[PDB]
RNA sequence: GAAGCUACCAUCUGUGGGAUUAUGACUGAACGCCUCUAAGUCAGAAUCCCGCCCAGGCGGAACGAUACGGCAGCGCCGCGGAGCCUCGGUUGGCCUCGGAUAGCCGGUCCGGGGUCCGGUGCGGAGUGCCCUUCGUCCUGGGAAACGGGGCGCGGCCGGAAAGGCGGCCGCCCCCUCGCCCGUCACGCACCGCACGUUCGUGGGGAACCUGGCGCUAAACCAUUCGUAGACGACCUGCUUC
RNA sequence: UAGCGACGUCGCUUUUUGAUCCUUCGAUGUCGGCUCUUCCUAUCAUUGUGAAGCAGAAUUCGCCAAGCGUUGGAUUGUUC
RNA sequence: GCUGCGGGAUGAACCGAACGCCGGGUUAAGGCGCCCGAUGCCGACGCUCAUCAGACCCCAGAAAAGGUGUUGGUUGAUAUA
């Protein structure tokens, strides 16, 4: 119905530094930085505030399906910022009911080889995208612990290694063996 | 970024219609697409306009939601937006055009006739002052 | 010296749609695009100015190979700008996209 | 004589119309890059159309037959040929007059190119509304140039940079000149009649 | 740095490596359907003849197909073998310390004095004496045909 | 039974990239939560396109040779002269990229950041320069030290995607009324009239008189060859060692 | 409601037959078989998929999907 | 049929309109992005996004049923106890 105004505020703390040429939202923290372009919302950002800083996120005369971006700014926007503060670390864990399924890392995480799943001599390398780097944890069993700043990055990854892991031509429900993320957290604790 | 606004009390130009070159004071917004606009000392009754008609300025004024006509030429003379509006840089262009529009032949000859020599001694100093710069860069 | 006509195309003749009318043509006279300004243009002279092999004779000079058709324009037509005119002779239909210079000749302002 | 018209943001069909509308007239009009004209809908809808053209060809014979062009200035050409009267003597002599071409070729980067802003995206599309580069559109279709053409692209851009920066420099000088030479110069008459 | 100067087939090629061969066919003439395209024969008890094609097209195409097989010119086609494997890379008539030595077609399980042309010759050719390739397999084009 | 044709009746070879469909997913609001979707991302195939391969357009490029002999003939530069066919124009605009909920200009500092002007765009194409000039002569004020045109020379190729005009410096036959304002005096003042003024030393073709610098062939036919041929066409040879 | 689904009811097709006789009576050569090209999809198999009363195997129901195949014979003129 | 003409791209029956040869003006039906004459009006309000959009009597295509895709309406029931 052209709703006149729909502002949307988000809080920043003081580790972080955000900035913004336009659309562009750059934030600055202690692990790293991000940037992400937003010239596909059409939606104002203006920040406010000495010592405090609040992002305003403002949308004039948008429909119904228009003004539900204002809100996925301000989300994304706390992704960043969760990010670049204490980070994204996703657990999978592997279920290998018969075959132990080997994984290992080859360069600094930015490759995992997975060998002897569901028996099959096939070699399934899945490349991480790039700042995110995974390893195999320690004090537990067939783990795999993915971190990184960027969440849509390291979720991509964990996504991509659990399809990596997906049985043909047989049963679902049955055979219950693959990667599948376990827990999703922070690297920092804490907060 | 959008430091214009539609308002209660906005004084906007009038682009193109029957008022086209005159300000109006925006009385109060109607149905999102026309408002109410008064400029009662530029000569303009008080009616409904749509916004893609006017165009917005600088000045603002204040003025409760629906007020008068008393009550609006007061605050208008209180800001005195007439002689402030000819000490700007956006009328004295509108000025300009109209006086280039307004041109006769024997301004048109005069016009020619200056600017041969405006433009010449323009031209030999810019071509003193790109040897000095180029003398300047050579060592 | 200096040109002394405003430039105008021949479009074409006047028409509907399965027929044609070869005695007022159509002209789009460079500078006017709008209904409100082609009073000036009215019964202004038009010249369709071409070249031909065989020299003729013209009312200064030496005969030359420079042929021209004469007429006027008559009335407006449509809210575009573009004009209409009637010639002694009819154009033809070669001059389509070419350039009928419209002189200054009867004056009003 | 010319009218060298830029080709990015102008949508396809806005400003094939206007071009055939002009060349009729007798303009010789030259659209030059053609890769960024812009076609309003969805790309894969685009695509879709596109292949749905494909598709048609003549069954006894294909190479005597509807004949498919895979560059986007041919693609422009074609969709100005669709408004031509190109089977008359009028539409064929004026064909000639219209020249579509891919990239800014050296007989076209020093000329300044115009702009019709009635074909534009800008104002002719809603901001939210989807739309496809008839360059991507093109390479991907059976179009092989894209990677050479951008390379040009750059070059002539990194060549323009430097001549506005030597545009720019020649301006600030002539407005120091300007302020420099303030006695001398009246000019009561350029500012009573504005210029 | 070697305009003006011979290159050998040794430097371009070598030994175990997959090749590829442009050549012109064996001309062959105009030919009829049944040698052209392969077209089954008719029955003996066919009138008009036996080796033709016995259906051209439908009757609404209104036009022939070109993917109807016609009789035409067969044989002297430009064409292109692929994987195609090297296997000898040979040369003789060296040196003048054996007044003339060959040493060609002899392996070293042979050890045998052998040369590449046959006993009698080739068959509408000439000699081999320069230095050659032997591909596996045949090869397209006629003899004393040349290929790339 | 030679040679030649021929057989899945013998022998050799038959190859990968992209955007994606179905589908499974990431982040994620609408709708405090959830959700593969509403804006944005990921993987994705005998399907689609292209790569390999087949023929190359009223498609264009690079290079070689470009007519002896005895009077010839044909090119390049500089040229003055006449005539014929064509159809079209009456100043030229020598350029940043890029967005439209943003950008332009100017700049101290450490390609980006900050600050200062402009912003229904005026360092603006509703724009700006050359310009609206009939010509000649005498003589005053402002501006002008580049001079101002080049049948002229040297240095750079400045720019390859379909390139040739422009700038700089040194001289050359010389030049301070070429610009703006004022001033004395003249000229096709054709007697009211059209096709006038322009990139025209326009494009194309056949020759005429004159100067300077250079060139001295190749195709087709006939004949031969067969790796090719219905006829054409196509692959080849000729030297007196 | 994995898979079917009666009593009812709504659609597509001219690969059957039928209804009418609009063009063809100074003739459009009217069955079947052989050879050969192309197209369609309402997919038998093959490529990638979802669901089962899918433990595996073998199967059944759909989705994008016509690129590639869909044979050899006994009797019948036979289509079947 | 016995009937031309302007629109329906095309046409026997549709919509206007009926016919000697011409010049000027206007109009019916229809139309104004280009074919092709005219919206090149600083036209108004609102709906619509399709990986099968939609685009004008005869006329050349479609139903029952369904949608937490949006946009309006009705009857109702809860909520500072
Ligand atoms: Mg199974
Ligand atoms: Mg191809
Ligand atoms: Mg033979
Ligand atoms: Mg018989
Ligand atoms: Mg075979
Ligand atoms: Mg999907
Ligand atoms: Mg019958
Ligand atoms: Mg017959
Ligand atoms: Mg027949
Ligand atoms: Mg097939
Ligand atoms: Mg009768
Ligand atoms: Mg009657
Ligand atoms: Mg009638
Ligand atoms: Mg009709
Ligand atoms: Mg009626
Ligand atoms: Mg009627
Ligand atoms: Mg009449
Ligand atoms: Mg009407
Ligand atoms: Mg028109
Ligand atoms: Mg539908
Ligand atoms: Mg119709
Ligand atoms: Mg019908």
Known sequence: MKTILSNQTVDIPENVEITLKGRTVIVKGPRGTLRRDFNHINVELSLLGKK???????????????????????????????????????????????????????????????????????????RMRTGVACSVSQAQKDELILEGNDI?????????????????????????????????????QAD | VFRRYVEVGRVAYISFGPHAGKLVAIVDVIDQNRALVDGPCTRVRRQ?????????????????????????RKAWEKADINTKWAATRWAKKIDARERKAKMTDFDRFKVMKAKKMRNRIIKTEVKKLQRAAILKASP | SGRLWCKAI???????????????????????????????????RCAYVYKAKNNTVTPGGKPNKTRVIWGKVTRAHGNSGMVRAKFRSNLPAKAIGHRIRVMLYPSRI | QVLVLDGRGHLLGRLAAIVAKQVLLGRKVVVVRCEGINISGNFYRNKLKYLAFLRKRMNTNPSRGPYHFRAPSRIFWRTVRGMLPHKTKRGQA????????????????????????????????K????????????????????????????????????????????????????????????????????? | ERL????????????????????????????????????????????????????????????????????????????????????????????????????????????SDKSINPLGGFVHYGEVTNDFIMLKGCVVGTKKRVLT
């Not at chain 2, 893609?52 to 629906?66: A, G, R, V």
């Not at chain 3, 007022?24 to 006279?29: D, G, N, Y």
């Not at chain 5, 430097?11 to 040698?35: A, H, L, P």
Request: proline share 3%.
């Open chain 4, 127 to 195: 901001p939210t509304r989807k739309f496809a580069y008839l360059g991507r559109l093109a390479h991907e279709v059976g179009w092989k140039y894209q990677a050479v053409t951008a390379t040009l692209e750059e070059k002539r851009k990194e060549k323009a940079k430097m001549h506005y920066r030597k545009k720019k420099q020649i301006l600030r000088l002539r407005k120091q000149a300007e302020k420099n030479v303030e006695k001398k110069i009246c000019k009561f008459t350029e500012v009573l009649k504005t210029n």
């Open chain 1, 152 to 188: 849509e990055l390291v979720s991509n990854s964990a996504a991509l290694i659990q399809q990596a892991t997906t049985v043909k031509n047989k049963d679902i429900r049955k055979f219950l063996d693959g990667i599948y993320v376990s827990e999703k957290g922070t690297v920092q």
């Open chain 1, 52 to 126: 405090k800083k609040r992002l305003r996120v403002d949308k004039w005369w948008g429909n119904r399906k228009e003004l539900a971006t204002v809100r996925t700014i301000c989300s994304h926007v706390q992704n960043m910022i969760k990010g670049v503060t204490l980070g994204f670390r996703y657990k999978m864990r592997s279920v290998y009911a018969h075959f132990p399924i080997n994984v290992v890392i080859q360069e600094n995480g930015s490759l995992v080889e997975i060998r002897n799943f569901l028996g099959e001599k096939y070699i399934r390398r899945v």
């Open chain 2, 48 to 72: 409904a306009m749509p916004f893609k008609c006017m165009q917005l300025t600088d000045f603002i004024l204040k003025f409760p939601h629906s007020a008068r006509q008393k009550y609006v």
């Open chain 3, 10 to 44: 021949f479009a074409g003749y006047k028409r509907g749609l399965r027929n044609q009318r070869e005695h007022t043509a159509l002209l789009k006279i460079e500078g006017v695009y709008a209904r409100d300004e082609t009073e000036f243009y009215l019964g202004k």
């Open chain 5, 4 to 111: 003006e100067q011979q290159v050998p087939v040794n430097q371009v090629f070598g030994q175990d490596e997959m090749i590829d061969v442009i050549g012109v066919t064996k001309g062959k003439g105009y030919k009829g359907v049944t040698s052209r395209w392969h077209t089954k024969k008719l029955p003996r008890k066919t009138h008009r003849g036996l080796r033709k094609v016995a259906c051209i097209g439908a009757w609404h195409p209104a036009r022939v197909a070109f993917s109807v097989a016609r009789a035409g010119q067969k044989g002297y086609h430009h064409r292109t073998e692929i994987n195609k494997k090297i296997y000898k890379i040979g040369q003789g008539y060296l040196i003048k310390d054996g007044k003339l030595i060959k040493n060609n077609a002899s392996t070293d399980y042979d050890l």
């Open chain 4, 94 to 125: 004026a064909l000639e007059r219209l020249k579509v071409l891919d990239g800014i070729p050296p007989p076209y980067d020093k000329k300044k190119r115009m702009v019709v802003p009635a074909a534009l995206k800008v104002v002719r599309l």
